[PDB]
Coordinates of C-alpha atoms and ligand atoms in Angstrom, one line a residue:
Chain A
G41 CA 17.3 28.4 5.2
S42 CA 13.7 29.7 5.4
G43 CA 11.3 29.5 2.5
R44 CA 7.8 30.4 1.4
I45 CA 5.6 29.6 -1.5
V46 CA -3.7 29.6 -9.7
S47 CA -5.3 27.3 -12.3
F48 CA -4.5 24.4 -14.5
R49 CA -5.8 22.4 -17.5
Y50 CA -4.1 19.6 -19.1
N51 CA -5.5 19.6 -22.5
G52 CA -9.3 19.6 -22.0
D53 CA -11.1 21.0 -19.0
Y54 CA -9.7 23.0 -16.0
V55 CA -9.0 20.7 -13.1
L56 CA -7.7 23.3 -10.7
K57 CA -9.3 26.8 -10.7
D58 CA -8.7 29.6 -8.2
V59 CA -6.1 27.9 -6.0
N60 CA -4.9 29.9 -3.0
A61 CA -2.3 28.3 -0.8
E62 CA 0.8 29.1 1.2
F63 CA 3.6 26.9 2.4
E64 CA 6.5 27.7 4.7
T65 CA 9.6 25.8 5.7
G66 CA 9.4 24.2 9.2
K67 CA 5.8 22.9 8.7
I68 CA 4.2 19.7 7.4
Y69 CA 1.2 20.0 5.1
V70 CA -1.1 17.1 4.3
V71 CA -3.3 17.4 1.2
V72 CA -6.5 15.4 1.2
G73 CA -9.4 15.2 -1.3
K74 CA -11.1 12.4 -3.1
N75 CA -9.9 10.6 -6.2
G76 CA -9.4 12.8 -9.3
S77 CA -9.8 15.9 -7.1
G78 CA -6.4 17.2 -8.1
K79 CA -4.0 16.3 -5.3
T80 CA -1.4 14.8 -7.7
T81 CA -1.7 17.7 -10.1
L82 CA -1.4 20.3 -7.4
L83 CA 1.8 18.7 -6.1
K84 CA 3.4 18.6 -9.6
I85 CA 2.7 22.3 -10.0
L86 CA 4.5 23.0 -6.7
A87 CA 7.4 20.8 -8.0
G88 CA 7.6 22.6 -11.3
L89 CA 6.8 19.5 -13.4
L90 CA 3.6 21.2 -14.5
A91 CA 3.3 24.7 -15.8
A92 CA 0.2 26.5 -14.5
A93 CA -1.5 29.8 -15.1
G94 CA -1.4 32.2 -12.3
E95 CA 0.7 33.8 -9.7
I96 CA 3.2 31.7 -7.7
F97 CA 5.7 33.2 -5.4
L98 CA 9.0 31.9 -3.9
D99 CA 10.0 34.3 -1.1
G100 CA 8.0 37.1 -2.6
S101 CA 9.6 36.8 -6.1
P102 CA 7.5 35.3 -8.9
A103 CA 8.2 31.6 -9.4
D104 CA 8.5 29.7 -12.8
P105 CA 8.2 25.9 -12.9
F106 CA 12.0 25.9 -13.2
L107 CA 12.7 27.8 -10.1
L108 CA 10.3 25.5 -8.4
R109 CA 12.3 22.4 -9.5
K110 CA 15.3 24.2 -8.0
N111 CA 13.7 24.3 -4.5
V112 CA 11.1 21.6 -4.4
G113 CA 12.0 17.9 -4.3
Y114 CA 9.5 15.4 -5.7
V115 CA 8.5 11.8 -5.2
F116 CA 6.1 10.3 -7.8
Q117 CA 3.2 8.1 -6.9
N118 CA 4.9 5.5 -9.0
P119 CA 8.6 5.5 -8.0
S120 CA 9.7 3.4 -11.0
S121 CA 8.8 6.3 -13.3
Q122 CA 11.5 8.5 -11.6
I123 CA 14.8 6.6 -11.4
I124 CA 17.4 5.9 -14.1
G125 CA 20.7 4.3 -13.0
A126 CA 22.9 1.2 -13.3
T127 CA 23.3 0.9 -9.6
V128 CA 21.3 2.3 -6.6
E129 CA 24.2 4.7 -5.8
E130 CA 24.2 5.9 -9.4
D131 CA 20.5 7.0 -9.3
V132 CA 21.3 8.9 -6.1
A133 CA 24.6 10.5 -7.1
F134 CA 22.8 12.0 -10.1
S135 CA 21.1 14.6 -8.0
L136 CA 24.1 16.1 -6.4
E137 CA 26.4 16.5 -9.4
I138 CA 25.4 20.1 -9.8
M139 CA 26.2 20.3 -6.0
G140 CA 30.0 20.9 -6.3
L141 CA 31.5 17.7 -7.3
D142 CA 33.2 17.0 -4.7
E143 CA 33.0 13.2 -4.3
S144 CA 34.4 12.2 -0.9
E145 CA 31.3 14.0 0.4
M146 CA 28.9 12.3 -2.0
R147 CA 30.0 8.9 -1.0
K148 CA 29.5 10.2 2.6
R149 CA 26.2 11.8 1.7
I150 CA 24.7 9.0 -0.3
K151 CA 25.7 6.9 2.6
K152 CA 23.5 9.0 4.9
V153 CA 20.5 9.2 2.6
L154 CA 20.4 5.4 2.0
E155 CA 20.5 4.8 5.8
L156 CA 17.5 7.1 6.3
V157 CA 15.3 5.2 3.8
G158 CA 16.8 1.8 4.8
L159 CA 18.7 1.0 1.6
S160 CA 22.1 0.9 3.3
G161 CA 23.9 -2.2 2.0
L162 CA 22.3 -2.1 -1.4
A163 CA 24.3 0.7 -2.8
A164 CA 25.6 -1.5 -5.6
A165 CA 22.3 -3.2 -6.2
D166 CA 20.5 -2.9 -9.6
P167 CA 17.2 -0.9 -9.4
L168 CA 15.7 -3.0 -12.1
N169 CA 15.7 -5.9 -9.7
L170 CA 14.5 -4.1 -6.5
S171 CA 11.1 -4.7 -5.1
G172 CA 8.3 -2.1 -5.4
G173 CA 8.7 -0.9 -1.9
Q174 CA 12.5 -0.8 -2.4
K175 CA 12.1 1.5 -5.4
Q176 CA 10.0 3.8 -3.2
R177 CA 12.8 4.0 -0.7
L178 CA 15.2 4.8 -3.6
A179 CA 12.9 7.5 -5.0
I180 CA 12.7 9.1 -1.6
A181 CA 16.5 8.9 -1.3
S182 CA 17.3 10.6 -4.7
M183 CA 14.9 13.4 -3.6
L184 CA 16.3 13.8 -0.1
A185 CA 19.8 14.2 -1.5
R186 CA 19.1 17.3 -3.5
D187 CA 18.8 19.1 -0.2
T188 CA 15.8 21.3 -1.3
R189 CA 13.9 23.3 1.2
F190 CA 10.6 21.9 0.1
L191 CA 9.7 18.2 -0.3
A192 CA 6.6 17.1 -2.3
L193 CA 5.6 13.5 -1.6
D194 CA 2.7 12.0 -3.5
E195 CA 2.0 8.8 -1.6
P196 CA 5.7 8.0 -0.8
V197 CA 5.3 4.9 1.4
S198 CA 2.2 3.1 0.0
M199 CA 4.0 -0.2 -0.4
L200 CA 6.1 -0.4 2.8
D201 CA 5.4 -2.4 5.9
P202 CA 3.9 -0.4 8.8
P203 CA 7.3 -0.1 10.7
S204 CA 9.1 1.2 7.7
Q205 CA 6.2 3.6 7.1
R206 CA 6.7 5.0 10.6
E207 CA 10.4 5.3 10.1
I208 CA 10.0 7.4 6.9
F209 CA 7.4 9.6 8.5
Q210 CA 9.6 10.1 11.4
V211 CA 12.5 11.1 9.1
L212 CA 10.0 13.6 7.6
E213 CA 9.1 14.8 11.1
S214 CA 12.8 15.6 11.8
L215 CA 13.4 17.3 8.5
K216 CA 10.5 19.6 9.4
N217 CA 12.3 20.3 12.7
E218 CA 15.3 21.4 10.6
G219 CA 13.5 23.9 8.3
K220 CA 12.1 21.7 5.6
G221 CA 8.7 22.3 4.1
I222 CA 6.8 19.0 3.7
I223 CA 3.8 18.8 1.4
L224 CA 2.4 15.3 1.5
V225 CA -0.5 13.2 0.3
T226 CA -0.9 9.9 2.0
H227 CA -3.5 7.3 3.0
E228 CA -1.2 6.2 5.9
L229 CA -2.1 9.1 8.2
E230 CA -2.3 6.6 11.0
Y231 CA 1.5 6.5 11.2
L232 CA 2.0 10.2 11.0
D233 CA 1.9 11.8 14.5
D234 CA 3.2 15.3 13.8
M235 CA 1.7 17.7 11.3
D236 CA 0.7 21.3 11.0
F237 CA -2.0 21.8 8.3
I238 CA -4.6 19.8 6.3
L239 CA -5.6 21.1 2.9
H240 CA -8.9 19.8 1.5
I241 CA -9.4 19.8 -2.3
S242 CA -13.0 20.1 -3.5
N243 CA -14.5 21.3 -6.8
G244 CA -11.1 22.0 -8.3
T245 CA -10.0 24.3 -5.5
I246 CA -8.8 24.3 -1.9
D247 CA -11.8 25.0 0.4
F248 CA -9.9 24.3 3.7
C249 CA -6.5 24.8 5.3
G250 CA -6.3 24.4 9.1
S251 CA -5.4 22.1 12.0
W252 CA -6.6 18.5 12.3
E253 CA -8.7 19.7 15.1
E254 CA -10.5 22.2 12.8
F255 CA -10.6 19.4 10.2
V256 CA -12.5 17.0 12.5
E257 CA -14.9 19.7 13.5
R258 CA -15.5 20.3 9.8
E259 CA -17.0 16.9 9.0
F260 CA -16.3 16.7 5.3
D261 CA -18.2 13.9 3.6
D262 CA -16.0 13.4 0.5
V263 CA -13.0 12.3 2.5
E264 CA -12.4 10.0 5.4
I265 CA -11.5 11.4 8.8
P266 CA -8.6 9.3 10.2
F267 CA -9.8 7.1 13.1
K268 CA -6.8 8.3 15.1
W269 CA -8.0 11.9 15.2
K270 CA -11.5 11.0 16.5
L271 CA -9.8 8.9 19.2
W272 CA -7.7 11.9 20.0
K273 CA -10.8 14.0 20.3
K274 CA -12.4 11.5 22.7
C275 CA -9.5 10.0 24.6
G276 CA -6.7 12.4 24.1
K277 CA -3.3 12.2 22.3
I278 CA -2.3 8.8 23.7
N279 CA -0.3 6.0 22.2
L280 CA 1.9 8.1 20.1
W281 CA 4.4 6.0 18.0
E282 CA 7.4 7.4 19.9
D283 CA 5.9 6.3 23.2
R284 CA 5.2 2.7 22.2
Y285 CA 8.4 1.9 24.1
Chain B
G238 CA -10.8 -27.9 -0.3
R239 CA -8.9 -28.3 2.9
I240 CA -5.2 -27.2 3.3
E241 CA -2.6 -28.5 5.7
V242 CA 0.9 -27.2 5.8
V243 CA 3.3 -29.4 7.6
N244 CA 6.8 -28.2 8.7
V245 CA 7.8 -26.7 5.4
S246 CA 11.0 -24.6 5.1
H247 CA 12.4 -23.0 2.0
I248 CA 15.8 -22.0 0.8
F249 CA 16.8 -19.9 -2.2
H250 CA 20.0 -20.9 -3.8
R251 CA 21.4 -23.5 -1.4
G252 CA 25.2 -23.6 -0.9
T253 CA 25.9 -20.5 -2.9
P254 CA 26.8 -17.3 -1.0
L255 CA 23.5 -15.8 -1.9
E256 CA 21.6 -18.4 0.0
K257 CA 18.4 -17.2 1.6
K258 CA 16.2 -19.0 4.1
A259 CA 12.7 -17.7 3.2
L260 CA 10.8 -20.0 5.5
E261 CA 11.6 -22.2 8.4
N262 CA 9.6 -25.1 9.6
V263 CA 6.1 -23.6 9.4
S264 CA 2.9 -25.6 9.6
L265 CA -0.7 -24.6 9.7
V266 CA -4.2 -25.8 8.8
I267 CA -6.7 -24.0 6.5
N268 CA -10.2 -25.6 6.7
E269 CA -12.6 -25.6 3.8
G270 CA -14.5 -22.3 3.5
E271 CA -12.1 -20.7 5.9
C272 CA -11.1 -17.0 5.6
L273 CA -7.5 -16.5 6.7
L274 CA -5.4 -13.4 7.1
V275 CA -1.7 -13.8 6.7
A276 CA 0.2 -10.9 8.3
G277 CA 3.8 -10.1 9.1
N278 CA 6.5 -7.6 8.1
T279 CA 8.2 -7.4 4.7
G280 CA 10.5 -10.3 4.2
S281 CA 8.7 -12.5 6.7
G282 CA 8.0 -15.0 3.9
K283 CA 4.3 -14.3 3.3
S284 CA 4.4 -14.3 -0.5
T285 CA 6.6 -17.3 -0.7
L286 CA 4.4 -19.4 1.7
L287 CA 1.3 -18.8 -0.4
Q288 CA 3.2 -19.5 -3.6
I289 CA 4.1 -22.9 -2.3
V290 CA 0.5 -23.6 -1.2
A291 CA -0.6 -22.5 -4.7
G292 CA 1.8 -24.9 -6.3
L293 CA 4.1 -22.4 -8.0
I294 CA 7.1 -23.4 -5.8
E295 CA 8.4 -26.8 -4.7
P296 CA 9.2 -26.4 -1.0
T297 CA 12.8 -27.2 -0.1
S298 CA 11.5 -29.2 2.9
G299 CA 8.1 -30.3 4.4
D300 CA 4.9 -31.0 2.4
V301 CA 1.5 -29.5 1.9
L302 CA -1.6 -31.7 2.1
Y303 CA -4.7 -31.0 0.0
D304 CA -7.7 -32.7 1.5
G305 CA -5.2 -35.0 3.2
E306 CA -2.8 -36.0 0.5
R307 CA 0.2 -34.5 -1.4
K308 CA -0.2 -33.5 -5.0
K309 CA 1.8 -32.2 -7.9
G310 CA 2.0 -28.7 -9.3
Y311 CA -0.6 -29.1 -12.1
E312 CA -3.3 -30.5 -9.9
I313 CA -2.9 -27.8 -7.3
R314 CA -2.9 -24.9 -9.8
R315 CA -6.3 -25.8 -11.3
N316 CA -8.0 -25.4 -8.0
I317 CA -6.0 -22.5 -6.5
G318 CA -6.2 -19.0 -7.9
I319 CA -3.5 -16.6 -6.7
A320 CA -3.3 -12.8 -7.4
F321 CA 0.2 -11.5 -6.9
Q322 CA 1.0 -8.3 -4.9
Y323 CA 2.3 -6.7 -8.1
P324 CA -0.3 -7.4 -10.9
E325 CA 2.3 -6.6 -13.6
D326 CA 3.8 -10.0 -12.6
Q327 CA 0.6 -11.6 -13.9
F328 CA -0.1 -9.5 -17.0
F329 CA 1.2 -10.6 -20.4
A330 CA -1.7 -9.7 -22.7
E331 CA -2.6 -6.6 -24.6
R332 CA -6.3 -7.0 -24.0
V333 CA -8.2 -7.5 -20.7
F334 CA -10.1 -10.4 -22.3
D335 CA -6.9 -12.3 -23.2
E336 CA -5.5 -11.7 -19.8
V337 CA -8.6 -13.2 -18.1
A338 CA -9.4 -16.0 -20.6
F339 CA -5.9 -17.4 -20.1
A340 CA -6.5 -20.0 -17.3
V341 CA -9.5 -21.3 -19.3
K342 CA -7.6 -21.8 -22.5
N343 CA -4.9 -23.5 -20.4
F344 CA -7.2 -25.8 -18.4
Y345 CA -10.4 -26.2 -20.3
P346 CA -9.3 -25.6 -23.9
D347 CA -12.7 -26.5 -25.6
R348 CA -14.9 -24.4 -23.5
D349 CA -16.1 -21.3 -25.1
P350 CA -14.2 -18.9 -22.8
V351 CA -16.4 -15.9 -23.8
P352 CA -19.3 -16.3 -21.3
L353 CA -16.8 -17.3 -18.6
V354 CA -14.7 -14.2 -19.0
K355 CA -17.9 -12.2 -19.2
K356 CA -19.1 -13.3 -15.8
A357 CA -15.8 -13.3 -14.0
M358 CA -15.4 -9.7 -15.2
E359 CA -18.9 -9.1 -14.0
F360 CA -18.2 -10.7 -10.7
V361 CA -15.5 -8.2 -10.0
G362 CA -17.6 -5.3 -11.3
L363 CA -16.0 -4.8 -14.7
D364 CA -18.5 -4.0 -17.6
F365 CA -17.7 -6.5 -20.3
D366 CA -18.1 -4.3 -23.4
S367 CA -16.3 -1.4 -21.6
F368 CA -13.3 -3.4 -20.6
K369 CA -12.7 -6.5 -22.7
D370 CA -10.6 -4.6 -25.3
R371 CA -8.8 -2.2 -22.9
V372 CA -5.1 -2.4 -22.6
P373 CA -4.1 -3.7 -19.1
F374 CA -1.0 -1.5 -19.0
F375 CA -3.1 1.6 -19.0
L376 CA -5.6 0.7 -16.4
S377 CA -5.9 2.3 -13.0
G378 CA -4.5 0.4 -10.0
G379 CA -8.0 -0.5 -8.9
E380 CA -8.9 -1.6 -12.4
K381 CA -5.6 -3.6 -12.6
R382 CA -6.5 -5.3 -9.3
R383 CA -9.9 -6.3 -10.6
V384 CA -8.5 -7.9 -13.8
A385 CA -5.9 -9.7 -11.8
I386 CA -8.6 -11.2 -9.6
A387 CA -11.0 -12.1 -12.5
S388 CA -8.1 -13.8 -14.3
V389 CA -7.6 -16.2 -11.4
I390 CA -11.3 -17.0 -10.4
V391 CA -12.2 -17.5 -14.1
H392 CA -11.5 -21.3 -14.0
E393 CA -13.7 -21.6 -10.9
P394 CA -11.1 -22.7 -8.3
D395 CA -12.1 -23.6 -4.8
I396 CA -9.3 -21.6 -3.2
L397 CA -8.5 -17.9 -3.7
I398 CA -5.3 -16.2 -2.6
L399 CA -4.9 -12.4 -2.6
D400 CA -1.4 -11.2 -2.0
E401 CA -1.8 -7.6 -0.7
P402 CA -4.8 -6.5 -2.9
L403 CA -5.6 -3.2 -1.2
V404 CA -2.3 -1.4 -1.6
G405 CA -2.7 2.0 -3.2
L406 CA -6.4 2.0 -3.0
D407 CA -9.0 4.4 -1.4
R408 CA -11.4 3.7 1.4
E409 CA -13.9 3.5 -1.6
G410 CA -11.9 1.1 -3.7
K411 CA -10.9 -1.0 -0.7
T412 CA -14.6 -1.3 0.4
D413 CA -15.7 -2.3 -3.1
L414 CA -13.0 -5.0 -3.3
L415 CA -13.8 -6.5 0.1
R416 CA -17.3 -6.6 -1.2
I417 CA -15.9 -9.0 -3.9
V418 CA -14.3 -11.0 -1.2
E419 CA -17.5 -11.4 0.8
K420 CA -19.1 -12.7 -2.4
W421 CA -16.5 -15.3 -2.8
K422 CA -16.9 -16.7 0.6
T423 CA -20.7 -16.6 0.2
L424 CA -20.1 -19.3 -2.4
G425 CA -18.6 -21.3 0.5
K426 CA -15.1 -21.0 -0.9
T427 CA -11.9 -20.4 1.1
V428 CA -9.9 -17.3 0.6
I429 CA -6.5 -16.3 2.0
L430 CA -5.5 -12.7 2.3
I431 CA -1.9 -11.4 2.8
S432 CA -2.2 -7.9 4.3
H433 CA -0.7 -5.2 6.6
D434 CA -4.1 -3.5 6.8
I435 CA -5.3 -5.6 9.6
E436 CA -7.9 -3.2 11.2
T437 CA -9.8 -3.1 7.9
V438 CA -9.3 -6.7 6.8
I439 CA -9.9 -8.3 10.2
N440 CA -13.7 -7.8 9.9
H441 CA -13.7 -10.2 7.0
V442 CA -11.6 -13.1 8.3
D443 CA -11.9 -16.0 10.7
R444 CA -8.3 -16.7 11.7
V445 CA -5.1 -14.7 11.7
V446 CA -1.6 -16.2 11.1
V447 CA 1.5 -14.0 11.6
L448 CA 4.9 -14.7 10.0
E449 CA 8.2 -13.3 11.2
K450 CA 11.7 -13.9 9.8
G451 CA 10.4 -17.1 8.2
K452 CA 8.7 -18.5 11.3
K453 CA 5.1 -18.6 12.3
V454 CA 4.9 -16.5 15.5
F455 CA 1.1 -16.6 15.8
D456 CA -1.9 -18.7 14.8
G457 CA -5.3 -18.3 16.2
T458 CA -8.7 -16.7 15.6
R459 CA -9.2 -13.0 15.2
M460 CA -10.5 -12.7 18.7
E461 CA -7.5 -14.5 20.0
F462 CA -5.3 -12.2 17.9
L463 CA -6.6 -9.0 19.4
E464 CA -6.5 -10.3 22.9
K465 CA -3.2 -12.3 22.8
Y466 CA -1.0 -10.7 20.2
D467 CA 1.6 -8.1 21.2
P468 CA -0.4 -4.8 21.0
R469 CA 2.7 -2.6 21.2
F470 CA 2.3 -1.6 17.5
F471 CA -1.5 -2.0 17.0
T472 CA -3.1 0.9 15.2
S473 CA -5.5 3.2 17.2
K474 CA -8.5 1.3 15.9
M475 CA -7.0 -2.1 16.8
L476 CA -6.4 -0.8 20.3
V477 CA -10.1 0.0 20.6
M478 CA -11.2 -3.3 19.2
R479 CA -8.8 -5.0 21.7
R480 CA -10.3 -3.0 24.6
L481 CA -13.8 -4.0 23.7
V482 CA -12.7 -7.6 23.3
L483 CA -11.2 -7.6 26.8
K484 CA -14.5 -6.4 28.1
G485 CA -16.2 -9.4 26.4
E486 CA -17.8 -7.5 23.5
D487 CA -17.8 -8.1 19.7
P488 CA -16.1 -5.1 18.0
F489 CA -16.3 -6.8 14.5
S490 CA -19.3 -6.0 12.4
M491 CA -19.6 -2.6 14.2
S492 CA -19.0 0.9 12.9
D493 CA -16.0 3.2 13.7
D494 CA -18.5 5.6 15.3
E495 CA -20.1 2.8 17.3
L496 CA -16.6 1.6 18.3
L497 CA -15.9 5.1 19.8
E498 CA -19.0 5.5 21.9
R499 CA -18.1 2.3 23.8
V500 CA -14.7 3.6 24.9
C501 CA -13.3 6.6 26.8
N502 CA -16.6 7.0 28.5
Ligands
ADP882 N1 -2.0 13.2 -17.9 C1 -3.2 13.7 -17.8 N2 -4.0 14.0 -18.9 C2 -5.2 14.5 -18.8 N3 -5.9 14.6 -17.7 C3 -5.3 14.2 -16.5 C4 -3.9 13.7 -16.5 N4 -3.6 13.5 -15.2 C5 -4.7 13.8 -14.4 N5 -5.7 14.2 -15.2 C6 -7.1 14.6 -14.7 O1 -6.9 15.5 -13.6 C7 -7.9 15.2 -12.6 C8 -7.1 15.2 -11.3 O2 -5.9 14.5 -11.4 P1 -5.0 13.9 -10.2 O3 -4.3 15.1 -9.5 O4 -4.2 12.8 -10.7 O5 -6.2 13.3 -9.2 P2 -5.9 12.9 -7.7 O6 -5.7 14.2 -6.9 O7 -7.1 12.1 -7.2 O8 -4.6 12.1 -7.7 C9 -8.5 13.9 -13.0 O9 -9.9 14.1 -13.2 C10 -7.9 13.4 -14.2 O10 -8.9 13.1 -15.2
ADP883 N1 14.1 -15.8 -5.8 C1 14.7 -15.4 -4.7 N2 16.0 -15.4 -4.5 C2 16.6 -15.0 -3.3 N3 15.9 -14.6 -2.3 C3 14.5 -14.5 -2.3 C4 13.8 -15.0 -3.5 N4 12.5 -14.8 -3.3 C5 12.4 -14.3 -2.1 N5 13.5 -14.2 -1.5 C6 13.7 -13.7 -0.1 O1 12.8 -14.4 0.8 C7 12.4 -13.5 1.8 C8 10.9 -13.5 2.0 O2 10.3 -12.8 0.9 P1 8.8 -13.0 0.5 O3 8.5 -14.5 0.4 O4 8.4 -12.1 -0.6 O5 8.0 -12.5 1.9 P2 7.2 -11.2 2.0 O6 6.3 -11.1 0.8 O7 6.4 -11.4 3.3 O8 8.2 -10.1 2.1 C9 12.9 -12.1 1.5 O9 13.9 -11.7 2.4 C10 13.5 -12.2 0.1 O10 14.8 -11.5 0.1

């Protein structure tokens, strides 16, 4: 289905003030901004893991953190602090037990979701003995299985090899084509070829939301402009990851 | 000082059904003062290879020559510092000081470790009074990476190995950490880097070795790498460096902006 979606302080100062943003299903949003600018905080608010002061809508209707957790999937920056299970398939199956229950479908579903992240064959493995990058694939899998309309990914593939990074991004690119809203912060923008909007966070607020073209023309100095985009500006959209073969 | 790897292979759990061939008959040479990049996908055997060179693993086959001759674990480990890709595999202490001072209290147990730790921490850009008492568990990833490095250069080894030290860092934090690398090799010491971030790391190395499914599928200089290696999955910046190389230019030690004016003209 379709979907559409402020200030915050932890405990001392306000980190986000006057935040105006809008996200729809079927688009990919990338959030940039320097360190401690609020990217992680902003994504948790969207997820409903932080309670913020202000006005948040979900399809027009006001949205409480709760209602967000209902419709927004999350992947932490640190995937360890996210999973609890005896086996890999146990951490996944966790997210679908409200989903009807229904089992013959779970085992068919979990099957699908492990394949996407590349953990097929490790269903019975013990998460406490997985590598860092493997935990990341698992965190993404338990999030994908909830079947939310929005996915919030705070650096989801930081510890994967480049080919796996592309494979995940490409999964995200096909979820978007199927009516998912993707909000994503990443340093691996090189391996992401399809995306709709870039949001820049500065001074505790969003001072930009536009295309990558508009972003390049912008010339922000607090963030890096991906080399790939300048190349695109000078040489054209060549050497896309789909066309490497 | 000088490292030679000669046809080493490595098996985990021989015979048993969970038998894993990590390495297969790999050999290479690392000269003294050399700066080497070890690349290759996940599971290619990068971490294992450098663990064997550091003397943490006894290779199932082959040998490693240190300035010409074999050695045992203890001798190797005094002169080879290795920072693991996951720094929590290194940590065991509740203070940064104790984490760093360890290799000194293990190798040179009469030396006052205080001014040693103080300058190793200074070498990596960690204020001594600000950090000596901090709990490693609650440091930022960049701070954890610094402590991991200081704790392995503290006993003044001649070789430094960094297994994927830039993962989860900013363009800032990466730059500042390579700054630490340049320092190291200004002391004329050899340093090995395991990394997937080639386009950023390559400006700081001499040779590039590539692993794949346990086998070495490339060994050569960085110039050779760009011009000879399969460019099918080079990043956009690597493709520009490669272009420039094939036109007989020197893309290294040149800005991203400067790279771009010399292409697509
Ligand atoms: N648990 C917390 N308690 C107090 N302050 C926090 C907490 N998490 C983050 N902050 C503060 O919020 C600011 C932005 O946080 P964050 O969103 O993590 O930054 P980034 O967008 O760079 O990841 C930082 O200045 C930090 O000091
Ligand atoms: N203690 C172990 N027991 C079984 N298999 C192992 C062990 N250590 C490493 N391996 C295997 O060796 C292969 C190479 O891993 P590693 O040396 O970490 O290379 P890389 O760091 O490049 O992935 C991997 O496929 C891994 O499964």
